[PDB]
Amino acid sequence: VNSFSGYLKLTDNVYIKNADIVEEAKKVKPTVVVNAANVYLKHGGGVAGALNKATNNAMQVESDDYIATNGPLKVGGSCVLSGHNLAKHCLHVVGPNVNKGEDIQLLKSAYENFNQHEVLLAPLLSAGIFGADPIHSLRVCVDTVRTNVYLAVFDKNLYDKLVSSFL
Ligand SMILES: O=C1OCCN1CCNc1ncnc2[nH]c3cc(F)ccc3c12
Numbered sequence: 001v002n003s004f005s006g007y008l009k010l011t012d013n014v015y016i017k018n019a020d021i022v023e024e025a026k027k028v029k030p031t032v033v034v035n036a037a038n039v040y041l042k043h044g045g046g047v048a049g050a051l052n053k054a055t056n057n058a059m060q061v062e063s064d065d066y067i068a069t070n071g072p073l074k075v076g077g078s079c080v081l082s083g084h085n086l087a088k089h090c091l092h093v094v095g096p097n098v099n100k101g102e103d104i105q106l107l108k109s110a111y112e113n114f115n116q117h118e119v120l121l122a123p124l125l126s127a128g129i130f131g132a133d134p135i136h137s138l139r140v141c142v143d144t145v146r147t148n149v150y151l152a153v154f155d156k157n158l159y160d161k162l163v164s165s166f167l
C-alpha cells in the first residue's frame with residue numbers, strides 16, 4: 001500500500017491521474033519524482049521549469065554544480081539528485097526531443113531508468129514541449145517500466161484521451 005490517491009489503474013504496475021506533477025509531488029512527497037530533463041539540466045520550462053520554480057531555483061543551483069563536475073547527460077540517460085521540498089529524490093531523465101530530430105527509439109532507453117526505482121511519480125517523457133506523441137510515450141512506458149509508476153498528466157483533455165485509447 002502507498003499514498004498515491006485517485007489514480008486510474010492501467011496495468012499491473014502503471015497508474016495514471018490528471019494532475020500537475022508539481023502539485024502532486026507537493027502533496028505526496030514521493031521517494032522519487034521524475035523530471036523531464038534535458039542534457040544540460042537547464043530547467044527553463046515544461047515539467048522541469050515548473051518543478052524548479054517550486055524549489056525556489058534550488059534544483060537549478062544543484063544541477064549547475066552537477067554539470068560543472070560531470071558534464072552533460074546522454075539523451076536516454078539520467079541522474080539522481082535531491083528532491084528538495086518536493087520528494088526525497090529527483091530522477092532527472094532525458095527523453096528525446098523530437099523537435100530536434102532526436103531518435104524516438106531513445107524513448108525506451110529513457111524509460112528504462114525508471115526500473116532502478118521501486119516506485120516513482122513521473123510525467124510522460126518526451127511529451128509536451130519535447131514534441132513527441134503522448135499516446136506513444138504512454139505505450140512505451142507501459143511496455144518498458146516494470147516498477148510501480150504513477151503518471152501525472154497535466155492537461156485534462158490529454159488525460160481523458162490517454163485513458164480512452166488504451167485497451
Ligand atoms: O499533460 C500535458 O499537457 C501538456 C504537456 N503534458 C505532459 C507533460 N507536462 C506535464 N506533465 C505533468 N505535470 C506537469 N506539470 C506541468 C507544469 C508546467 F508548468 C508545465 C508542464 C507540466 C506538466
Ligand SMILES: [Cl-]
Binds near residue numbers: 047127128130
Ligand atoms: Cl510540457
